[PDB]
Amino acid sequence: SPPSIQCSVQFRPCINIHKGKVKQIVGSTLKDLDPITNFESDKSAAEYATLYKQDGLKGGHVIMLGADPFSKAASLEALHAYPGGLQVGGGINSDNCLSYIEEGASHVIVTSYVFNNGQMDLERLKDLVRIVGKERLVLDLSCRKKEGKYAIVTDRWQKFSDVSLDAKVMEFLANFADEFLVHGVDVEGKKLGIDEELVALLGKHSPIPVTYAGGVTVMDDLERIRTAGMDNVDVTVGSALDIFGGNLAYKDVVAWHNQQKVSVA
Ligand SMILES: NC(=O)c1ncn([C@@H]2O[C@H](COP(=O)(O)O)[C@@H](O)[C@H]2O)c1/N=C/N[C@@H]1O[C@H](COP(=O)(O)O)[C@@H](O)[C@H]1O
Ligand SMILES: [Cl-]
Ligand code: NA
């Protein structure tokens, strides 16, 4: 709870593009293998990107949710507005991963492509690193408590894998990923608070930077990210931000992000 001169928890914004529009939803209600929608807008994804660039927020992510091809064009708008500022995910694979780097993304975020038959596919994973480099790959290990563990979920969170999120998995995938992104899908988009157990896990055993996402609702929940995460876990807020129809002031969340860069001088 008291500040840290060494560590600084980053706010990592998001842009959730579904069927061509910017939305925030309860992602666990997507059934495309109607989702509960928290917010829709016709504002171009490029305007959210420009806002983040203005406030110096780096390492946020654009998600192309679903197969609709108009989501691809809206994502390139945001990446073109904020070159190098955004990670981009949503159906990244071997054949298109490099293309997203060449459109201004700093990273691609991957889950489903590196999973086959419920297992981590080592050869697919090595193909990403070969093409884009580990430094431009983010692995998303979003998960859901199942039989006492955190099972990783694939295919837009509509399939349980057979890999559980634990220390041994993170030590291994860290040889292939610059960073980890982890949604607590049970609580995601539902504006009810966060998963403290998952954040505590991510902060104890992740050897590379890890962003938690899901259910951040009030400013006090940002202080739990610090507390449970031992100042090791970055945090995403989506459905609660006032710019996505919530009650949480985006400007307050930015101020909190800058308050974490504590300088003695
Ligand atoms: N059903 C889904 O919604 C879904 N499924 C997968 N993704 C992401 O897409 C990316 C690519 O996955 P693959 O296509 O490679 O499997 C990965 O990062 C996935 O986690 C999904 N979308 C996540 N959306 C994010 O949920 C967060 C909101 O938080 P909140 O404060 O609580 O409102 C923000 O990060 C939103 O952009
Ligand atoms: Cl699979
Ligand atoms: Na959401």
UniProtKB/Swiss-Prot annotation:
Residues at which 1-(5-phospho-beta-D-ribosyl)-5-[(5-phospho-beta-D-ribosylamino)methylideneamino]imidazole-4-carboxamide binds: N16, G27, G91, T111, S112, D140, R156, W157, H183, G189, G215, G238, S239
Give binding positions for Na(+) 2. S112, F115
GO BP term (any one)? L-histidine biosynthetic process
Short name of any one Pfam family annotated for the protein = His_biosynth
The pathway that the record names for this protein is: Amino-acid biosynthesis; L-histidine biosynthesis; L-histidine from 5-phospho-alpha-D-ribose 1-diphosphate: step 4/9
Which Gene3D superfamilies does the annotation name? Aldolase class I
So what EC number does this one have?
5.3.1.16
Provide the protein's localization: Plastid, Chloroplast
Domain of life the protein comes from: Eukaryota
Q: How is the cofactor bound?
A: Binds 2 sodium ions to optimize substrate binding.
Give me the residues that bind Na(+) 1, please. Answer: Q24, I25, E188
Reaction it catalyzes: 1-(5-phospho-beta-D-ribosyl)-5-[(5-phospho-beta-D-ribosylamino)methylideneamino]imidazole-4-carboxamide = 5-[(5-phospho-1-deoxy-D-ribulos-1-ylimino)methylamino]-1-(5-phospho-beta-D-ribosyl)imidazole-4-carboxamide
* Molecular function per GO: 1-(5-phosphoribosyl)-5-[(5-phosphoribosylamino)methylideneamino]imidazole-4-carboxamide isomerase activity
Q: What class of enzyme is it?
A: isomerase
Keywords attached to this Swiss-Prot or TrEMBL record, sorted alphabetically, are: Amino-acid biosynthesis, Chloroplast, Histidine biosynthesis, Isomerase, Metal-binding, Plastid, Sodium, Transit peptide
Where's it mainly located?
A: plastid
Q: Which cofactor does it need?
A: Na(+)
Q: Please give the GO cellular component terms listed in this UniProt entry.
A: chloroplast; cytoplasm
Q: List residues binding 5-[(5-phospho-1-deoxy-D-ribulos-1-ylimino)methylamino]-1-(5-phospho-beta-D-ribosyl)imidazole-4-carboxamide.
A: Q24, H61, G91, T111, S112, D140, W157, G189, G215, G238, S239
Its family remark reads: Belongs to the HisA/HisF family.
Q: What does this protein do?
A: Component of the histidine biosynthesis pathway that catalyzes the isomerization of 5'-ProFAR (pro-phosphoribosyl formimino-5-aminoimidazole-4-carboxamide ribonucleotide, referred as 1-(5-phospho-beta-D-ribosyl)-5-[(5-phospho-beta-D-ribosylamino)methylideneamino]imidazole-4-carboxamide) to PrFAR (phosphoribulosyl formimino-5-aminoimidazole-4-carboxamide ribonucleotide, referred as 5-[(5-phospho-1-deoxy-D-ribulos-1-ylimino)methylamino]-1-(5-phospho-beta-D-ribosyl)imidazole-4-carboxamide).
Matching PANTHER family: 1-(5-PHOSPHORIBOSYL)-5-[(5-PHOSPHORIBOSYLAMINO)METHYLIDENEAMINO] IMIDAZOLE-4-CARBOXAMIDE ISOMERASE
Name of the protein described by the UniProt record: 1-(5-phosphoribosyl)-5-[(5-phosphoribosylamino)methylideneamino] imidazole-4-carboxamide isomerase HISN3, chloroplastic
Gene source species: Medicago truncatula
Name the gene: HISN3
